[PDB]
Amino acid sequence: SRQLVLVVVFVALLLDNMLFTVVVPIVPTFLYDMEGFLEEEITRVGVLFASKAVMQLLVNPFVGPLTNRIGYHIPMFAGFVIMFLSTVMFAFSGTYTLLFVARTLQGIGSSFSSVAGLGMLASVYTDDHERGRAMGTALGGLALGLLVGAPFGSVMYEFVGKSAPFLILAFLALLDGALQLCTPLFMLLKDPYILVAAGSICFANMGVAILEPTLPIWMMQTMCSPKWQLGLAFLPASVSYLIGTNLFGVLANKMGRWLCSLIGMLVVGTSLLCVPLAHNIFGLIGPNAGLGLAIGMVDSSMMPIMGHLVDLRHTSVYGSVYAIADVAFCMGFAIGPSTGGAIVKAIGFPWLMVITGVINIVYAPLCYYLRSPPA
């Protein structure tokens, strides 16, 4: 029924965020277990983190005609089985080579699910009013999974073993399988307005993209924190992000969207600058919460601007914003860690954070162009 498909889509997006948010606090300690020596492996961890983004980009434009030719349910099956396989090898992987294949399979399955589930939700809901509510429910489940995934793997690593969280995620995925069993984008990427908005979103999310694969190694090398607080350190970045996106989605229309994006990028730069100063775990709640709140600001201010820009000058569909918005996230999560590993090899982590903050601040006042576009 209509509630069943929404439930399975919500659970699928939940697991999709759970896997990506549980990989981040496990892989560096996983490499530490078999063996300061992460300065040489930071590049390989950056490539392993950018593999999913690069695979999602390479398989992005192929699922379009595939869903039209063979329907929407069939591409669901491939994505779910591939993500089940990626989960099962991730709990069972022992070497660096298997992790890359697991990440590529996870990226392909994430792309297939993100296409097929939203396509099904659009197809089922033809009432023209409940579709937006279902999309909001899916986004809320996405945020809930983002919140839950970060403390999960770090807490259940040194306490209940290593394969426990991945096996639990695979078992939860098996539950959803039984429930489920019963103006193109290249034409929209030539005007300056949409390109500026996409660049703003990408440069806003690149900070949290670079914070993932390079922060735990810095924490282990300097702060001497235990192995269970590494996943807890990212909790403010999720909680503050959720409160910020709710509040500023409420409040952004009053004080202007372009000012929202400008102030959000500025506070992103300031938070990233203030991040590498703390010498204890308690010095990271401020900057991380600020960065999450700022990313909520920039996303909630840039999505309606993208929608209005597409509507005013071009003809749009139910999911025009999803194609462009997922492009900016893919550039962010693909160009963040791969370049960040080489940057940390050549120069220090604080220099990388200063560079990211400087880029965000310098790109900040280019959002003046987006105020009142013409026709």
Ligand X SMILES: C[n+]1ccc(-c2ccccc2)cc1
Q: Which stretch binds ligand X (CB under 6 A): 151-159, 234-242, 337-345, 365-373?
A: 234-242
Number of residues located near ligand X, criterion CB under 6 A: 8
Q: CB nearer to ligand YHR: give 146 or 260.
A: 146
Q: Which stretch binds ligand X (CB under 6 A): 60-68, 235-243, 253-261, 278-286?
A: 235-243
Q: Which stretch binds its own copies (CB under 8 A): 71-79, 93-101, 146-154, 272-280?
A: 272-280
Q: CB nearer to ligand YHR: give 93 or 154.
A: 154
Handedness of CA 128, 6, 107, 244 (dihedral sign): positive
Residues in contact with ligand X, shown as a per-residue x/- string from 277 to 296 under the rule CB under 6 A: ---------------x--x-
**Residue 208 contacts ligand X per CB under 6 A:** yes
Q: Which stretch binds its own copies (CB under 8 A): 100-108, 138-146, 239-247, 360-368?
A: 360-368
Q: CB nearer to ligand YHR: give 15 or 40.
A: 15
- CB 116 to ligand X: min, Å: 16
* Binding footprint of ligand YHR on the chain (CB under 6 A): 17, 20-21, 24, 139, 142, 146, 150, 205, 208, 212, 234, 237-238, 241, 292, 295, 303, 321-322, 325-326, 329
Q: CB nearer to ligand YHR: give 95 or 210.
A: 210
List Cβ neighbours of 133 (8 Å cut-off, separation of 6 or more): none
Q: Which residues bind ligand X (CB under 6 A)?
A: 146, 208, 237-238, 241, 292, 295, 329
